[PDB]
Every structure is written in structure tokens, then in C-alpha cells.
Amino acid sequence: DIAQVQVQNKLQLAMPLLPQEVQQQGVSVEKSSSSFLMVVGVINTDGTMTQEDISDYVAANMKDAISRTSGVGDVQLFGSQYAMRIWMNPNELNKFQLTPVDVITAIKAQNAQVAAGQLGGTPPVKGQQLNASIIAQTRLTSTEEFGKIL
Amino acid sequence: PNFFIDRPIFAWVIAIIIMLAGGLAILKLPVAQYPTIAPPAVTISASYPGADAKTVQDTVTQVIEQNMNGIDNLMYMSSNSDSTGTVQITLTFESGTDADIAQVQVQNKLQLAMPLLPQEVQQQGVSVEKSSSSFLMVVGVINTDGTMTQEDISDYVAANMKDAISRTSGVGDVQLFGSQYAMRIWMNPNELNKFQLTPVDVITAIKAQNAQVAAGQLGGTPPVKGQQLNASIIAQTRLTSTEEFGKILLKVNQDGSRVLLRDVAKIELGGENYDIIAEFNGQPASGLGIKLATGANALDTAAAIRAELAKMEPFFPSGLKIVYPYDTTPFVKISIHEVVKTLVEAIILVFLVMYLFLQNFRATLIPTIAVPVVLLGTFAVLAAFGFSINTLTMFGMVLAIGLLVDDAIVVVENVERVMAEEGLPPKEATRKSMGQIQGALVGIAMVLSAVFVPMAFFGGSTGAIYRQFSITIVSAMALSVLVALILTPALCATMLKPIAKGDHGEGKKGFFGWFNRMFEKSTHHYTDSVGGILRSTGRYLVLYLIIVVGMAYLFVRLPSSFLPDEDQGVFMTMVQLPAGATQERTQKVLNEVTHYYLTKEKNNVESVFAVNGFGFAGRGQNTGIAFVSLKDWADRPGEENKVEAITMRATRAFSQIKDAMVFAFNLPAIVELGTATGFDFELIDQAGLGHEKLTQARNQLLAEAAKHPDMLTSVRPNGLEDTPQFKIDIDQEKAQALGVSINDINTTLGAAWGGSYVNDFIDRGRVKKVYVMSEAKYRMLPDDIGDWYVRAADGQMVPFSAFSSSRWEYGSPRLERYNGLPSMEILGQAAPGKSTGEAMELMEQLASKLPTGVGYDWTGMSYQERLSGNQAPSLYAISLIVVFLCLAALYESWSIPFSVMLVVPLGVIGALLAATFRGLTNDVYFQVGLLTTIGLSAKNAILIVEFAKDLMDKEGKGLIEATLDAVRMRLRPILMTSLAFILGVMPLVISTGAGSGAQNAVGTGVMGGMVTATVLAIFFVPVFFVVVRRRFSRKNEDIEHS
Amino acid sequence: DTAAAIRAELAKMEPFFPSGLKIVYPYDTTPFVKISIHEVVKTLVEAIIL
Amino acid sequence: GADAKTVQDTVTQVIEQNMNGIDNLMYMSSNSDSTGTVQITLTFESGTDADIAQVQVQNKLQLAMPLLPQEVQQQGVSVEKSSSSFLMVVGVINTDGTMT
Amino acid sequence: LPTGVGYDWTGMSYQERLSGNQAPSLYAISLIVVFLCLAALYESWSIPFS
């Protein structure tokens, strides 16, 4: 544990001089083994769901607890969690005279959470009688809302 | 053992050595109210100004809960996502985990999670802390002459006191209650619109004109050959005045007219945040929370703190007084004082019993020396094992007196008895007697710890609580026995006066003890009578079974606690208003409370500390809480002037005649613990569900626990209910159309209604924050949304009503999580005369009946309790098996032990009787009470049966004769012990004043137990030894032999 | 210990799996150590009988 | 580039404020630079656990964090186990075509 | 020096100050250890004083 601490307190002086891509994709520092103590499997017998559906159930319902189980160093995913996958057409893009870059900025823009504030906020004016939250732009939820992105 | 009887000085040296190590451990030992008891919890706290419950949950919370993997000995994880924009994630760890290593591991996993966070959060600071909730003291700061506002005060605390007190020795942690100064910039939407400017431009203005810039150096390295000058370049300097912030330029107009900040908005030194307002007896007040350093002496920390405060008093601003609303300290002062009172008095009573029974002063000086010595030693044994002088270990010792006391008496009496019996010189009488009780003392040491040790190995917070007692008491006992085989035998053999053969002092003297005949006759009455019973034992076996069935019934029909509640000079009452209320509406209630306590409790209440914005159920304008301090107990006489009755009448007062919920209450002595007959159930969203489904589950379960009043009571949700929240749907198209950048809409919306952290300025030498936010009057009512305009791309202003639609909805003000997943916390307690466990199992039954995607779980108080209770029967199996094996050793029978183990119920029936008539509760102190009582009665029967076995085997005397004799020769000391004891415990059983809950809890059970135990043992032990022995061997027989 | 505890967590989650989602155990270093040492205890008691 | 009197009451004293409840601290001394560096030294009771001490210090300091500057925040503040005496100084020179 | 200007020693002379401060306590304890020891082996209370 102290070794882990000593390594990571140099990792932390290295961090700001790293790419933002690496930095937000996440850096991990761990005391692990070298080989697998064990490999847990999940299958679907009745073929009802595809591989990715599954990889998603595993990553979205289990892997966070199994990685919090005391004494477990690293977990490795055979599969992957879900993502919003946006698969660009180079032609259909060139058609409308647009770049990937525009997609990037767009999605950053129409999809976010916003610090909004409060009616009857603190510090209010005398006798105010209502206190309630302002809910502004909210993160997206369906695939469609992503299709409808302007 | 003999060795010392021929060497009094060597023993004197061992005594001096134990006394000095104890003296040393006494001088430099930690004192705290309680030991570390609760599992270690580390909390990550973060704030996101203006955000809503779902914002902070889905932008910060879940990102942290996912990046918290692989941290060692994780027990459980819970979080709060406050719609007041704060998130708190508490990781409670396995008991005995390194507090410091756990915390470090957490803070460096969060530190890698940091970049995946929002920049507002990343710059507001994420914090990591060790979670006790036991501040040694809570010091208040106020102003009398109304001279300064609460924020003014808060700042004074931060800027003039907090640091010296954190230098005050013995003070480990200081925590601030209030809000530091900030640069508050309050925009006028109208004067903003006039000049065709947005908050956005304000933000950029302030970021740009206020900063420090990398400047450089003259004659820099590498200079040019022959260079002549070296000095620093000082550049653009951060602003300092409110004025200089006024002068910052926002736009130059067409006519050369200037737009200064001064123009569009008010600028003032003001609070960093205005949620929480604190009032100390109606006056403006702010304050500090002091935590006791790890290992520090509590009472000295407090003394130093008050000394530091007085050391600052000549330098205070006008009317700035320090007040002390919360101090655990005088209670520990009085508790410690009272336990010492007990120990010295117990010595006095043992001296007085020993005189009014042996009326020979130099005898009565022996146990007078012994105990003082043994205690001093146990303090050194503790210090050796890293413990402290605290409530648990001190009442551990008050209990131990009896095992120490008896042990000395047993010895000296046996010397006295031999000299007056056979006529030996002092010393040779000693070897007869020590030679007699030696194995008995070694046996008692092994059986007494055979019952006192296994209870130490209890796991959890319960287990730790026991470990304090078990260790204190066992060591006290082992040292008493070593002292009884080295020192007291040495002190007998040397200073004890020789008694003429066949003395017994019957009369001989006129003035001091015509008693001895009186006694003598009677101890014959008694032995005559015991023989009498030894004829017809059967009927006596019957009586015994009656005692046992009655005993078990007493045990079942007695209620368990964890600890007893205490008037602590202090209690508090809590305030909860209807959702959405105003800071000022809550405030009204709290002003009313403050006055109630300052009126209809004029005589009891010293101070009322009302806090608006923080209560128990949550943070918000909506909730307030009032910490109430009481006049010292010296001035509060009756039973009505005590917390029970006080909180009774406060709640009785605030229930009928109120529009909101106001309960008044007292805190448990262990300030973070199991509501005894209570529990903490977690309702868990497990499938890809939504908050609605979970809440429906929760109500559904509330209905089904509403269905079991015979099992369940007052089962309640521990969250905040969904409130009406205001939704602003932005149409992206309309706004892109008119030419307004979506950011501009969002962030001016932001800086308007939420506020924004902009920059930092250096105030009076201390770097502080700069907040840009609305003025009040333009952001209160929904319609005010309208005063706000967005400058479009081209150069035009746009109403929010051009691109925003609005409505009301429901949402949650508090979003809870358990172990990474959405949860809902449910509290509860058991039916009246039912068990906690039954209610918990019925809870699992009700919850198993809940809809799919909804599972269930246990946390906290019912974690520690549900896992650490399958242990008691196992540890008591160890205790009986081990004790029987010990006594089996001491004698030489597999069966003779049963005679002495059969004594246990004789003491128990005494306590269970002693309690039920006192209406007390089978708690820890009563349990430690039972073991202590069992400890003496086993001591006594082990001695009787010892002498019995000894007369039978090494003098060939007959069964009925040897038992009779044994019971005869130890009638006297049994009675001596029990007399002294019953007299020493008597005060604890009839006490009020400080802590008397604990005192009565120890005292009662034991006193009653002692009474029945001796006044039953001196008849039942003989029957045991006899009836047991009459299922043995052959011939011998009833014996007359060589 | 780590493994027995992990089996506990999965067991905790099992009722809430999607329809047809079974767990399978393709690889575990654990049962070999358990049965391997168990043979050695078998032997000590056997040898006492011998 | 900041000046000494700045770094002392913006970074230094802001850091010294959190070194309360640090176990076995003998004395604390510090320096505040116009070359923009600041260094605060905690010397402990003899036999206090070095690694454990580092743990506690960096865990009071990381709470002092919300009160420091972002240039400070981006070039890094480090917490380290410090001697004060060089065990040895290895020298390097070049004999022939003397590189610089 | 004027009011408000105090002093301290650190490092070499802190530690030196501690050697100082400790010598007397060291002599009381070490001397008392021998007195209590000789009083032990040579059972007399008197052999120590001599």
C-alpha cells in the first residue's frame, strides 16, 4: 500500500503534463498480480441477446461491485460497456458541406447538464415565499434524441 | 509464594515497581470520553454551485462511484446527491482497518477520477475526510453591540482565531461553521440590458483584469558578459478593493463614455454562500468545531483552548465574545471524579468492614495497601496495550474492585483463622494458610479469565465495546492474584500480630466488640442448620430448580439496550418545515423555539444555538436545527429539571401548537450508534429502472410495514420527498435561429440564478473567492426570468421568452445511492415487547414481496449488529468448556467441578430480580454486572469445595464433616467480602447527578446479584459438593481414615 | 477468501439477471488448491489409522 | 514569477494552517520565494513512522488544496520524504576535448 | 531584544537542549533502579544506602 502511494504521488506530478485525451479516458495505478486468480463467465442460453447486450449487462450491473470486492486488484473485460455510437458517412457529410469537427461541437452543445440555480434563491429578498429548483438543459437519453440533434 | 514469606523486602520492591510503572502510566496516559468504537468511514465531499440533484448525481457522483475500485477492506459505500448542489460519498471500512491508509487510498483514487469531472467542480475543490462526528467541543463567536453581521463574524473567526487554536496543544482538528468572505458582484439585469451587455461579458471582464502574470527577471540567466543588474519584474496585479473591481471596464461606448462594472451591478464584500444562518440566542453568531488530537488528553486540550481564547480576548473587536455551546469536557471531568470517589470510598468501607470484623489495626492495614497497588498496575497494563482512561475502561475497574477486594481478604482472614486456631507464630501460620489457598487462587485466576476473556473476541463496534471491559478487568484480576501470592502473603507474615491458641476474643474486651460472641453463636446456629439440611437434600434440589426456572423467566422478560442515555448538560431539538418553505419561514419557527427555551425553561437553559440551513434530514432553507445548552447540573435539582422531562415538555409544547414538525431530543452517549431496538434497511434499484419505480416500491413497502404494528413500529423513509421543481425547456432551433449561442443562454441563465465562481482576490493578505451572481430582486419569482436578455450574434438582445418554454414538475431534492446503485434509505424499530431480530426478518419478508428490479439490503447499525450476533452462544460455549476444564485441573475430578459450576444461577436470579424491580435494562453494564457476579460466586464455591476436598483427602475426615467444617471456616470471609462490597456498590445504585444512568446500571444488577448469591451460596454450595460427591467412586465412603 | 467473497457478490446479484443470463465458470485456480490440500488431510487421518 | 510576500500568505500559510493533528510533529519551518518556489518542512519526533507520516501530511495538505492558485495546481505540489544532508556528490568532468 | 521577539533552537541545538534536559531525570531513574535492585538480591534494605 505504501508503495502504491509512493508511485501514485509521482504519477500525480506527471498527470498535468499528459494529454487530455489520456487524462479523461482515465489513468489507473494498481497493486495487482500478474496472472488471473479466476475468470468469470456469462452466457445467454436461449440466444435471446447478442454479445454486446451482454457485455453491457456485465459491465453495467456487476463489474463495479466485483471491482469493489476487497482483495480484487484488477478486473479485465472480455467485452465492453455501452456507448452512444455515432458512425459518420464521409459522403453524406461532404454533401452538406460539414466536418467531423462540426459533429463534435454540436454534440458537445446540444447534450449537457447545466448549473441552473433556484427560484427564491439564497440570499433572497424579504418575505419571499417560494423555493424551487431550476432545471435547464439535461443530458440525452435515447438514440433518437441523438438522431434529432440539430 | 513461600519465597516471599521469607523475603518481605523483595516483595516490597515488586510493589514499588508496579506502583511506579502505574504512576508513570497515570501521568502520561490519554483520557477521552470513549475509545475508538465505530468502523472507519472516509467521506468525499464536493459542491457544484446552482446544480440540481440530478446534475450533481450524473456529473460528479456516478463518476466517482465508478472510479472507486480496488480500495482495501471496503465494507460499504453510500452517497447523497443534494439538489443544493452538494454530493457526499461515504465509504465505511472494515473494523480495525488503517484509518490513515484507507483515507490515503481513497484520496488518490478520487485524484485520478478528477479529470473526468466538470470544471466547476474541479475548481470548487473535492475534499476527503475521516468521519467521526464527535467534536470534543463546539465554540461559538458572537457580537453583542450588533456591530457585525454573521458573515463578518465568520470571517473574524477564520482570520484571527482558527489558526492559534489549531496551534493550541492537544487540538487535532479545527472545523469552520459559517462562510468566509467573498467578492460579491450582484448584477442588475436592467442596467445590463440598457448597455446591451450579458453576464458573459462581466465574467470575461473580471477574468481578464484580475490576475497575476508570469513576469520574469532583469539580468536574467544567462545574462550578457559583464552584466550589472539582478532584480524581479512585478506585473499586472490582482485587484484588492471593492472599488478597483468597480473600475473594471466592460465596454467602451460609441460616444467615448465608459461602461464600468460599478455601473451595471452592486459590488460588496459578502458571503461565499448564504444557505446557513446561525443565531446564538437571537444575536448574530458564527463558530468552530474542535476535534481532540489522536492520543491527546481531552481535559488538557479543553483547558488550553479556554486559555488561548482568553489570550486573545485583549485583541478582540468591540463586543466580540467567545461562548461555549458544546463541551464534552465537564461531563468527563465529573465522570472521572465520581469513579475516583468510588475507589477511595471502597477502600474506606473495606477498612471499616475489616475493623468491625477483625478489630486489629495492623491487619486492617494490609488490604488497605494491596488494592492501591494492583490498580496502579492495571493502568500500566493498559498503557502497555495502548488503551486510555475512558468511560468503558473505568467502569471496567469499578467492577474489578470486587475481585481485587475479595482476593486480599481471603488471604488475611485465612492467616487470622489459623493463628487463632492452632496457635502458630504469625509466619508459620501464614505458610499453613498460603499453602492452603494457593491452588485455589491459581484456579480462580484461570476460571475468572475463562469467563472474562472470550467476550473480548466479539467482532464489530459491539465487540470493541466489550474489548475495553474484558481487557481492563482481566488484567486487574491477574495482577490481583500475583499480588495475593507475593505481596499480601508477604504483608501478612510480617506485620500481622500473633493470636493466642483458641482465642476468638469472646468478650475479653469491654468497650469495642461485645459483638464477637454475638457473631460466634450465630455462625454455630448456621453450621448446625446446614448440617440440618444435609440430611434431606432432595427438597433442596427442588428449591433449586424453582430458582432456575424463575431465573430464566426473569431473563427472557427483561429488555435489552446498548447503553443508557445521559443528561449531558446539553441536548438538541430539530425543525423540519413543509417542502419549499423560505429561509425566513424556517427562521420564524426557530426564533419561536429560541424564545421558548429562553422562557418556559428560563432556569434550565443556558443558551439556544439555532441553525437555519442545516438539520438532520438534510441541508436546505427548508430545514433548521437548534442545539440547546443547559445550565450546569449543580443548579438543576429535581427530576423535572432533567433532559427526560425537558425534552418531553419541549416536544409536548411544539407539537399541538405548530404548523411544522419540531421534535426535541437527547443524543446517545456514544454519539454515532445503534438505536438498540432499531435498524437501517436499504431499498435498492437494481435493474435498468428509474426513480419513479423505486419510489413506488418504497410506498408499497411503507404500506406493508403499516400492516404490521405487532412487529414493526414508526417505519419511515430517510430521505426528502419529491418536490415541485421548475423546468425550463430550451428550444434549440428558435435560439439558433435568432442568432444566440447556446452557451450564452445557459451561462447567463447560470450566472443569474445559480451564481458563478469567477476569480480570486487577495484580501488583507488572504486569498479569497470572487462570485458573480444576480441581484436578489431580479431572480426570485419565475416571471423575473423575463428581465434577462441574451445578446445575439449580430448585436441584438433577446428575451428568454423568445426561446424558452416552461413548466412545473416533480423531482427529487435528494438522490441517494448505496454501493454504486440508486437506493432509498428506510429506518425502523421493533414492536414494544418484541426482538430487533424478528422485526428485521419480517422486514426481509415484506421486502421480498416487492416488484422486480427492487432488491433489498442492510446497512450501518444493522450491518454491525446482523453479522456480530451469531457469536455470543459460541463464545459462552468456550467459556463453560474452558472453566470446567480449569476446575477439573485444580481438583482432580471431571465431576467435582459441577459442584462449583452449579452456583451460577444463584447470583443471576439476584440481578434479574434486582433489575426488574428497578425497571432497568439488560444492557452492557448489566451484562458486565452478571459476569462480575458470576465471578465472585465461583470464587466462593471454589474456595469452599477446595477446603472440603482438602479436609477430605489430606485429613481423612468424613464427607458431612469436611463439608460442614469448610462451610464453617469460610462463612466469615464470605460475609466480609459481601459486606464491604454491598456497601461500596450502594452509592452507585442510589445516585443522580452526572452520568447516573451508567452508575445505576452497573450498581443495581450487581448489588441484587450479590445479595441473593451469598445468602444462597452458603446453603446451596454445601448441598452441591455433597450431592455431587455422592455420585463418585466406592469405598471410601463417608470415611474415617489415616 | 477473495474468491469466496466474489462468489458471495455474484450470488447477491443472481436473482436480478435478465432472462437466460446464466453464470458459467470457465477457469478457477481455486478448486485445485481446495481438493489438493483436502487429499493431504485425508492422508493424515488415514495414516493415524495405519 | 510571483513575489515572496505573496507566496507566503497565498500558498505557505494556507498550507501551514492544515498541519494540525499531525501526529508526532516536532517542529515546522518554511521558505517563500520570488523565484516563485515555496517549501514547507515538517520535522518529526524521533522514531515517528516516516512512511506513515508522509501519509498523514499529504492527507492534511490535500485538504489545504481548495485554497491554493491554479498555476500552483498545474505545475504540481509534491509531498516528499526529506533529508537535509547529501550522502555524497558524484562528480563528472571531461578530460580531453572538453565538452561543456 | 524588544517585546515580541523570542527565540528557539532547532536541529543540533534542539537535540543538544534535549540531552541537557534529560541527564538529571536519567540519573534519578538509573540510581533508583540500582537501589531497588540491590535491595532485591541482597535482601537487606540497608545494603543499598551503603
Ligand SMILES: CCCCCCCCCCCCO[C@@H]1O[C@H](CO)[C@@H](O[C@H]2O[C@H](CO)[C@@H](O)[C@H](O)[C@H]2O)[C@H](O)[C@H]1O
Ligand atoms: C448472611 C446470609 C445469611 C442470611 C440467611 C437468611 C435466612 C434464611 C436461611 C435458612 C434456610 C435453612 O433452614 C434450615 O432448613 C432445614 C430443613 O431442611 C432445617 O433442618 C431441620 O429440618 C429437617 C426436617 O425436615 C431436619 O432433617 C433437621 O434435623 C432439622 O434441623 C434447619 O434447622 C433449618 O435452619
